[PDB]
Amino acid sequence: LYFQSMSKQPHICVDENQVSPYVIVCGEPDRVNRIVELMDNVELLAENREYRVFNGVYKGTTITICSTGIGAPSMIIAVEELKLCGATHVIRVGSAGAMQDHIQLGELIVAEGAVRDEGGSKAYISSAYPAYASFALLKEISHFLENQSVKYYFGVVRSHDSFYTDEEDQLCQYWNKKGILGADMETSALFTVGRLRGLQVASILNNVVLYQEGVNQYVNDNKAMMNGERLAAITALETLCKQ
Amino acid sequence: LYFQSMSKQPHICVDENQVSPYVIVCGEPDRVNRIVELMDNVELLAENREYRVFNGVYKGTTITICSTGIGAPSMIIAVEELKLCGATHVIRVGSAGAMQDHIQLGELIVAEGAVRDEGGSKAYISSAYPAYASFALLKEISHFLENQSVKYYFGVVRSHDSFYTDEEDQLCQYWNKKGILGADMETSALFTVGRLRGLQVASILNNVVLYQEGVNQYVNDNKAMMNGERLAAITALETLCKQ
Amino acid sequence: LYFQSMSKQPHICVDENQVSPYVIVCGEPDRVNRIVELMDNVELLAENREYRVFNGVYKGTTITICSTGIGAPSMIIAVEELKLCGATHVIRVGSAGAMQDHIQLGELIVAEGAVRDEGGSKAYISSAYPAYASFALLKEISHFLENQSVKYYFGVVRSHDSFYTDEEDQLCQYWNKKGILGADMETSALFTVGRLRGLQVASILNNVVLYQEGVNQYVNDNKAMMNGERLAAITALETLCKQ
Amino acid sequence: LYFQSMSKQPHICVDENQVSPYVIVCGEPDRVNRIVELMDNVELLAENREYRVFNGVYKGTTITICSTGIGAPSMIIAVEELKLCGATHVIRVGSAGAMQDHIQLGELIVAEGAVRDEGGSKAYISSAYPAYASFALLKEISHFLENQSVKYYFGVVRSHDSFYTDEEDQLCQYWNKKGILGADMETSALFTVGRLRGLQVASILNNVVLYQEGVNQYVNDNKAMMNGERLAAITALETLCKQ
Amino acid sequence: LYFQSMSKQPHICVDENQVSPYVIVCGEPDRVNRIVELMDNVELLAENREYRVFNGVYKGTTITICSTGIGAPSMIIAVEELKLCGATHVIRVGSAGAMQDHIQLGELIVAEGAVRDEGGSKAYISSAYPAYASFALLKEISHFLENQSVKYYFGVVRSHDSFYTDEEDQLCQYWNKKGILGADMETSALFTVGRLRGLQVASILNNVVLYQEGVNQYVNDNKAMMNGERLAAITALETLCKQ
Amino acid sequence: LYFQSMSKQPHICVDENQVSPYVIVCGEPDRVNRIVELMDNVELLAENREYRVFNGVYKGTTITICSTGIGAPSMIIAVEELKLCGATHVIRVGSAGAMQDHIQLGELIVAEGAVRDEGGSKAYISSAYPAYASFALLKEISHFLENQSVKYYFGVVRSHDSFYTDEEDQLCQYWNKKGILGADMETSALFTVGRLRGLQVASILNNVVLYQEGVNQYVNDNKAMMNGERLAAITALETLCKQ
Numbered sequence A, B, C, D, E, F: 001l002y003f004q005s006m007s008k009q010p011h012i013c014v015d016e017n018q019v020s021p022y023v024i025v026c027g028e029p030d031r032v033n034r035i036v037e038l039m040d041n042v043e044l045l046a047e048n049r050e051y052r053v054f055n056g057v058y059k060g061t062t063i064t065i066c067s068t069g070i071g072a073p074s075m076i077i078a079v080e081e082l083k084l085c086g087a088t089h090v091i092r093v094g095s096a097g098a099m100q101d102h103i104q105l106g107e108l109i110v111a112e113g114a115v116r117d118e119g120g121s122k123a124y125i126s127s128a129y130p131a132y133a134s135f136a137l138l139k140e141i142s143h144f145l146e147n148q149s150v151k152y153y154f155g156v157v158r159s160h161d162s163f164y165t166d167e168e169d170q171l172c173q174y175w176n177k178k179g180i181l182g183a184d185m186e187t188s189a190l191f192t193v194g195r196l197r198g199l200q201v202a203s204i205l206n207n208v209v210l211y212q213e214g215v216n217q218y219v220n221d222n223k224a225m226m227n228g229e230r231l232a233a234i235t236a237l238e239t240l241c242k243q
Ligand SMILES: O=C(O)c1cccc2cc(O)ccc12
Pocket: A031, A034, A035, A037, A038, A226, A227, A229, A230, A233
């Protein structure tokens, strides 16, 4: 009761004896339960606020799965506390809204780099510092994805703090013209804070919004997005077990 | 199944028929369950990611209780979708870390104004726009609090995107000298975005960190913080049922 | 001659033995003469540049009346020197140009908060710090105004350094859409610098420009504006004598 | 009564039939009365708030003398309205605080350029735009000053919105090291806004503060500053009558 | 004479018939002459200001070699005009000053990402946009370098506009603590502008300054730097001929 | 060989025994060869990258001529190293693109002031610091130019880091309306860094682009630009030999 408040990190509620060097983070707590279905020797570590934390084993490698909620500030809390617990490699398995016409629902966006349009990373360092993915991780992600059939795109995503501003339309058109593939709320914060803490970082995003329907299409789309999530999780697991 | 995706807001997962004009928001999903214990005719509306949404009745007035997770971006999603559902008055019942020496754990900080050091509100409008609480709400909060015994402080809080930067020490000392009472991650975003959407807004914060112990003190402190949370919730409920 | 340069503040030209804790500031030197007509035991304290300084008594309370000229920099000089002389409560009785259609000439705008679009407050502190009015003062201002017949509006004003830029039209439309009630040159500087110096602060503004005429209307409008000024001064005096 | 509000500029309260193309501006209203003592055919044009406006004749040339109060915002109002009245050449006769050790009281600083650390000019144009004095005017100012005995310095001044910030000490040392000669509140705004409105502009500043005393020295210093003011006014008058 | 001004790009002085899709850029004109010594079928294309442009063949692939002078603005001119001439892959072979202790002269820094502390890229796009190297190119650079003996480092470099500011010491220590490997003047501009123009981009830097000597050591150091340059050029050539 | 690396500045490759107090800088290395044709006792000092450095004598005065390449960063390197070598007066003889309709090719723009829209000067000091030309130098430049027939214009130029951005059209129209005479890449950096290093600075620009043709006109235009360059060089030489 008291020894836990002493030993555990205050938000993710785990310690260095529990956290693997290899970690997958995702925004949605329920996604953690889905991801561990792909793994053996699964155990619940902690549940606190938006932070749901499990360990599992994939091809002999222990990997920690951690939800972080929506947005840079909740991601950054997780990244810092995971680092304190001995994390060394962190892959985000997330969702994105497409910023280019021909990206279908359930297709994947692999963030090589990210526009730092969220405030969280800016608390740490000038915006001029690059948010980009680790080469070692991208190499394995590429090797895995090129050997299957679902379409995927490597490039730049935009991370931001709100899609509900009255300028959303203007922003979407501007960023589309700059060749941004998709938008999320967290990738740039993982890339910036993680790199500064010496972590290897990457981000694999399931497309869940078209750039721009009946019950049948609705069901088909849901299945496509579920398939994309599964592919993203598998790609991350395959990448991390090879480290 | 399909009609819900049509009718419900995509994150808080409720509609205009469900949401009261009067709303309490909090960061912690489990706090919603604690708050509704103070209310009658309670019903679960939605549970999605960090958004846990209930209705209850307090002295004849229906009030919606909504968790929002940690950080401005998740708060802003909630504020926007609540507005779309017909919210008119929103009070944050939250936690803060004290920025002045003599603020004890479980004492309350009522945010008259907030430093906009989070990125979320900046997506909407120049930082020069004031984050401040609605007079109508502050009047009722003051009237209630002055008639009880727990210490409370009206003034400025700082809202930010990270307490884990290497400059945290420098920031704390700077802001202490400027007379800031406490820090959180969300108040300024509620105040800025809410006011811009025409909402009456306020924020009542339970102090959960001293500016600067045995098992006994640990238990005493936990009780004090629980008492402070309860007081904050009651103050918000008393304020909203009088609108 | 020499002892005065030693004892008096260098711009307002008064000392701590002269200044009341309770102060009204206004931009126009001649307005001071008009305000003291409402007061007893009136005495001229100092006249220097745009700073015209008088004491008077209103319902048994001594209150200092001080002009400050146009603009944040001249206001800030006054605020700092008044603070040094022992001021504790300062109310601005000023003029504004309306930023909403239905605000008539001589109606009052009570600034709950202010957009810090002037440079003066920015010299002191990041623009993210809120410019807002003190609750204690707003409560008394509201109580007084609700008991009379002239229309008044509580909300946000914009303070700025120039209404003569070629973008004035664009600014007016932008700020109108954001729900700003009116514009002046000084309120945000009083609110920011005053709060930082530990002063209770408020601002009551007479509307002197429509958002958007014969000799008869011209005379009627002048009378309306004079009536509004008188009401603003009375409201400030009633508020301060009750402290 | 009504025709005046139609014809006169709203702050300086004069029209195009009254204002000379050649104008001296100063902060202090009482300085206008002192300056016109050096001139013939003097007439009071207007008195409104901090704006005291006179015409006089110096060596056959009619020149308008206009006070502007303290600070960029009140200066800018004057510059804009003078421009509207047909001003073409404007010289500031002002005061400065020295930022270098060996500048004595009553010695003159001629601003070749100015640091735009005031908000007023920033309302008009990016800070990257240069605040500098007109060559035609500097040539005549130099020609006049080199032919007399009081020490004077050509170079950069800093214009700002407050000398009362808690960082004043840090600012003074920083700017001293950058070779700034002196500080005022208005020069950069005249230079920036005036140049943008197509005016020839210059600024001659009487030093009134040492960078860093008995009744005797106090009197001697006052005389020195009065002599410096007189020299500055004469230099401006000699320059403008030669245009 | 006249047809050339019509057909050739105005600074690099070549056209689309001359430029290969595959290009090496370097700052030093004389480095171009050294690089082409490694190539067959070499021809001088143009010589204009700091832009010295040659074609050569390396393992059957035609590659253009182009000097760009020092600094982002001259680099950006080259990138834009090369793009207009049909460039698709551009590798910078440059020099850097080390920002970490154990990087020896003539060891290589491969820029995965770059801090955009130069103004050139900022003319195009918000600093929040990432300056990073293309995965396809990094994969080949890594594959080549891991198969030889000279030490090399993948990571972040800082690109800037001056190493001669009085804050150079403070900057070096700050950036060293952030884990930056080395500094140059151009990499971030190539990465930002090149990516925006749809180019594949990379940067291989020869270390020419220790983070922190007799005639013998001087000669040894010069040889080491020459060997490093040669290695960098070979790596770029090997990478591009495989595209 | 080794003593040179010890004694010479690392980019301009000259020392204090070689550099005159009086210096002309230009962007184009080949322009140095053209300028020295106007001079006696000419000697090549150094050739390194874009830096071509010669001494010559003009009417008994030794003057150093130094090319600097394109852009602020390469200019700033030259300014700093020239200062270290004992330079005291530096005049830029450069090219500009006209920003006003009636400025013909080969007419001269004398920069009184410059918009600091390049990053190089910003590395040194806040953009609010003025980039302007030295009075002593402008006086002599004016005296010389008024006594000949080629049209010339004194006023503001804009210095920037790229003319190839997609906003070039918008920028040109904006700056044209603000009365900017012409644009280059270096003037503001010379003015800012040079003034901070205590140098007397000026800039004389040959117009080489109309704001907005057959072989005959092409040849006529080339001659006009050559004549303008010659005039600019002569003006600089006449100015410096009189110091
Ligand atoms: O359990 C599955 O095989 C599965 C099937 C469908 C969707 C899934 C999504 C995940 O994130 C993980 C696993 C799945």
